[PDB]
Design a protein around this nucleic acid. Sequence first.
RNA 1: UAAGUGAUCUAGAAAG
Lengths: 53, 335, 80, 30, 108
Amino acid sequence: KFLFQELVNELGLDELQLRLNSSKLDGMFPLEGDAEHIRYSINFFTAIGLGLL
Amino acid sequence: PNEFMQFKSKEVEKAHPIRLYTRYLDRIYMLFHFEEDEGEELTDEYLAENPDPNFENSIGYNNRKCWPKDSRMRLIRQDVNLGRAVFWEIQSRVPTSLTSIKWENAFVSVYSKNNPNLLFSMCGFEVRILPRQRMEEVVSNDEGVWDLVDERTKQRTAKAYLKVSEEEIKKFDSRIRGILMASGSTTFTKVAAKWNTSLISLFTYFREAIVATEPLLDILVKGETRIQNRVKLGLNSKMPTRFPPAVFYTPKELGGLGMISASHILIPASDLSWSKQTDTGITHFRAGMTHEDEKLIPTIFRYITTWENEFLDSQRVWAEYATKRQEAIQQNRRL
Amino acid sequence: VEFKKKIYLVLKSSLSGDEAAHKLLKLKIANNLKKSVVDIIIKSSLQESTFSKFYSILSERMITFHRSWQTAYNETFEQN
Amino acid sequence: SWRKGTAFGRYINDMTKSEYHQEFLHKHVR
Amino acid sequence: SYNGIGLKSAKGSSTSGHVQRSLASNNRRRPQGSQQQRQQRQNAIKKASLAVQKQIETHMEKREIEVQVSELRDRLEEEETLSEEQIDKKCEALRAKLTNEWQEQQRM
RNA sequence: UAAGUGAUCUAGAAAG
């Protein structure tokens, strides 16, 4: 959470999203559902100001 | 009433040129945000009022002499004219019989198309604000740089590089001199104590901003060595072998002096002829306060929380406090 | 143990991070302990009240220097 | 428009009275 | 001093005045090569992207004809054509034959 | 197409 906060503060939100989009991001941003598992990641990222969840 | 530099709306904030203002102790800090039209008007009225055929007025301009050529305010015929014009306007605004607002004691910085940096001094700092969008390549934000944050987006929109003002450096030097003199009577411990006090004042006041100013570094080394020679002179010794850093930097508990090194720092000594023109990445490190059998005496600067960290941290902890206060209220308890 | 102490001293004795980085590079430390050095640096960072630009700059410098240090920083991250 | 709303809108042979001297004193007192 | 970079001199400074080159200098020496991927990405992001031509074509065309004329001149001046009539006649022929061919071109 | 060569001041006696 702290790390992400730092990143956002430094780079920017949309920019950050773009950057991560370019990368793989398996554990952070899984696309293959895995049965109410994205819920978890999604939930956690709703805790901080993040979009696209 | 408004909080410090807040506004009831955006519209009101935007209405006037004079977007911010503050009089720290007989030194006003008017920030104007002109449009091209307004600027043109100002230049017009001034220039017409006070003509000059050549550029001319670029000389006799109060630039920030501490900063480097391409860092400080560039001298564009237009921007400079605007600046001077602005100053003239301000002077007109205040009556002369009440106070002396002489140009000579006034620094005017300008930000524009042709001027990317934005300078000032305040509370004995020198602060070069440079927005991220204007920077050619945002390197790893160095130390002695405040990344400023935009309130809306929460992104690091602008940087603020920090030097210590020449005036403050001079004051410090004077302090050191004072300490040195009236110390024939004074004993080593007392001398070192005074010096310690001086140093801690100098840092704890502007902590982060020491990194930049090479003159201040020089003063610290020079000053510190002078202090050491006060002891070493006192023993009529004044000699390297027989005063290893044990005697100085060891605390008063162990028969030492308690001197606080801001010395054994490596002084960043970049190419002096180039450095005057533009800021360089520090390339060559000079040896500051050296010694034979060099035990790496830690500085003091590493053990003081640099201001930016202190302030972000402050914001965090105070936020936390606020939140817990609310919790206490809800729970009806003494926090 | 004493190596660690030395490293710590090198960190402290610098003014800004760059100086510290320079000092560390001068140390001539072999590929063996680079990871250990990085760990030490991290721990030192932790010891402080807050995150410092200093340490970040130092990290950057070292990283830039040689691929081995990049590797070390990575593996340290993994460890963390 | 904005510049209207203000209150004010539009050698001697004495070493103790030299322009240099007064200026100097101003400089070196605070 | 050394390479615009040493201390003016060790007297004053109150120190050795020893002058190391930093080893972050190698980082400042090659940050474009080290962080080439920073600009590379950016570049990639924007990496996808008549009258004059006509004029050029015209020049080529007229020029070709003029080359024919020149050739005629060559043939004449070299091989038995001391008179001016020969030259002029040749030119005329070139104009007629050339602009005939080029009229054909126009038609197509 | 991806490292580390190098610049190193002083310096103690008298009288006050």
